[PDB]
């Protein structure tokens, strides 16, 4: 019935930057105005891994096949859509040239471009963790690998002896809560501790270069730094990792606040990859401070270009950037942009909800939850102890989250509400 | 000089006590799946494989 919408076209009325949550909006903006529109949609990278599902595959519960999606998948088959990153924008002009040259125009603009990884930030760390063998391990696996490579499950379970470290980058950074996995380490080193597997002269340190680690929820924090506490795990502020050497296995630390920086000696390294801010946002003059969209907290539209907006990682939003999150960022993104298309008032309000599981244990997890004041709902906090309530929580999450996803860049399921 | 006239060809194996040593039991068998509780972890833990434990199961 419908004709696909075309790509070869000179200007739109709502452009999209971004798969992961550029591409659910989309496909959640044109199914609520029955297509009215013509929006076309410009990612980077051609996967989306699910670090929704991080932990629960570093446990191998979750297939390989299950954690890598295509970016195409999340964008529907109507809009038309193009691999190539924009390579500057012009807000003044309405317009967006990307890397290959071509202007194109718009009317609104939703960017969703996230906090891009820099795996350079830490010198010769990617070239480690590409490395089948050597004990450095990240929280993505590099697109070279292959479906029979899993490396990234012996983090845990390849930790006979050494010294191991957990290394958290400089905020901001993705997946705060999200892939954190020193709880479930601690849980299975302390069995391998009792017979034997694992040497009695070994040491495990977080090293988070922050001071704290959840930032806009501090009923959260304060309770990870008194379950780290309870474990007996030691943990370093202010220092963040900054070379990785593959020869002799020495890592380089600094700690920033007194600019000090030592080499230590690992056998067992993992650290989230760092963020970088995208200096074409800078020189557009749309992010502020830390690198990060300026844009309203209520109905998530930039301060200045009314037409322009923003949702995800990319946005500074006094709330913790999970996925969940962004369920309800869709939601008032697609509706203030329907609005404006229409000249209509901007009636949607994101109230800052953010939800991401927390594994307290092996097989047990506590639920994240808190709203623009860091105040917690009913879940905040809940069944943290381990139990059979936090037992069954867990199984929901870790075998029947991750194909819930493929629903979710097709369009079967919406959000949770 | 009879490691001059050894093949190398036979290191493809590491047999000790009838197992071979260089098997891929993090990709393949029951030792496969890493979320095994602290059961099933310390009964792996002595018997270092599947087959050992499975023929002796059959018996139990
Ligand atoms: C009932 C009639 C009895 C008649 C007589 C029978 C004879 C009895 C005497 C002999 C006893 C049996 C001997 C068996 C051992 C033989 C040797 C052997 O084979 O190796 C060990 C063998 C190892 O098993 P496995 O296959 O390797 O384990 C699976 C994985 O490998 C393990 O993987 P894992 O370790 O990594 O993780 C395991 C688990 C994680 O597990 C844990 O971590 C938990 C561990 C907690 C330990 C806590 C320790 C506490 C210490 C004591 C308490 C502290 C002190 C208290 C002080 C109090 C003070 C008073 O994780 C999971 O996710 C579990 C999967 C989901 C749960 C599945 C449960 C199925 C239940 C179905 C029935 C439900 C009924 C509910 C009704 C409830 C009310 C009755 O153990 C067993 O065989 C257990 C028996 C199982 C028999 C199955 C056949 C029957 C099916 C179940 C019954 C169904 C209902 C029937 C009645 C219905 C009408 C009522
Ligand atoms: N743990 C992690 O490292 C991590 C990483 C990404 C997403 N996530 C999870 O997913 C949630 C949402 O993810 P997200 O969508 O905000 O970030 P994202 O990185 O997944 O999405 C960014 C998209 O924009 C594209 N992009 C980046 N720069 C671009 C540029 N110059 N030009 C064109 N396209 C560009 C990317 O290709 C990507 O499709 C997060 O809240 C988080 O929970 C986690």
Same mark, same amino acid.
């Given at each position: 019935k419908r004709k696909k919408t075309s790509g070869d ?11 992961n949550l550029g591409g659910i909006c989309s496909n ?39 954690? &890598? ?11 038309? *859509?193009?691999?190539?990153?924009? /390579? =500057?924008? $012009? ?49 993505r696996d590099p697109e070279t690998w292959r479906s ?57 340190? &977080? ?11 501090? *009923?959260?924090?304060?309770?990870? /730094? =008194?379950? $780290? ?189 | ?60």
């Amino acid at each position: 019935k419908r004709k696909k919408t075309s790509g070869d076209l000179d200007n739109y009325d709502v452009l999209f930057v971004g798969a992961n949550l550029g591409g659910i909006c989309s496909n959640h903006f044109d199914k609520d105005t029955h297509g009215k529109y013509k929006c076309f949609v410009s990612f980077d990278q051609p996967i989306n891994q699910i670090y929704s599902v991080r932990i629960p595959y570093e446990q191998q519960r979750v297939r390989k096949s299950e954690y &890598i999606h295509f970016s195409k998948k999340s964008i529907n088959q109507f809009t038309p *859509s193009e691999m190539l990153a924009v /390579k =500057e924008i $012009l807000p003044e002009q309405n317009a967006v040239v990307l890397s290959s040259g071509r202007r194109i125009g718009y009317n609104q603009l939703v960017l969703a471009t996230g906090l891009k990884h820099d795996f350079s930030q830490i010198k010769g760390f990617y070239e480690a963790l590409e490395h089948p063998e050597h004990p450095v391990y990240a929280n993505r696996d590099p697109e070279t690998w292959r479906s029979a490579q899993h490396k990234y499950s012996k983090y845990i379970s390849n930790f006979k002896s050494g010294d191991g470290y957990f290394c958290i980058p400089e905020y901001p950074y993705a997946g705060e809560v999200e892939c954190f996995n020193f709880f479930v380490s601690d849980e299975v080193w302390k069995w391998a501790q009792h017979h034997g597997a694992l040497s009695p002269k070994h040491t495990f340190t &977080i090293v988070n270069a922050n001071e704290k680690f959840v930032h806009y929820c501090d *009923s959260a924090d304060a309770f990870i /730094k =008194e379950r $780290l506490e309870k474990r007996g795990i030691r943990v370093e502020y202010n220092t963040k990792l900054l070379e990785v050497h593959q020869d002799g296995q020495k890592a380089t630390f600094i700690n920033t606040k007194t600019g000090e920086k030592s080499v230590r000696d690992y056998n067992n390294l993992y650290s989230i990859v760092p963020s970088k801010r995208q200096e074409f946002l800078d020189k557009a003059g749309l992010t502020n401070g830390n690198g990060l969209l300026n844009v309203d907290h209520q109905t998530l539209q930039h301060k200045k270009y009314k037409n322009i907006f923003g949702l995800g990682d990319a946005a500074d939003l006094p709330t913790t950037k999970t996925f969940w999150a962004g369920w309800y960022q869709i939601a008032v993104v697609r509706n203030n942009v329907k609005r404006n298309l229409q000249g209509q008032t901007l009636n949607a309000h994101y109230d800052g909800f953010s939800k991401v599981p927390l594994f307290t244990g092996h097989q047990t997890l506590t639920y994240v939850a808190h709203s623009y004041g860091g105040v917690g709902n009913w879940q905040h906090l809940k069944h943290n102890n381990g139990g059979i309530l936090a037992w069954m929580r867990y199984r929901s999450w870790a075998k029947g989250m991750a194909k819930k996803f493929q629903d979710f860049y097709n369009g079967a399921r919406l959000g949770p509400p | 000089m009879w490691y001059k006239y050894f093949s190398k060809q036979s290191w493809n194996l590491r047999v000790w006590r009838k197992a071979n040593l260089k098997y891929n039991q993090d990709d393949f068998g029951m030792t496969q799946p890493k979320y095994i509780a602290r059961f099933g972890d310390f009964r792996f833990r002595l018997v270092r494989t599947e087959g050992a434990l499975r023929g002796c199961m059959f018996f139990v």
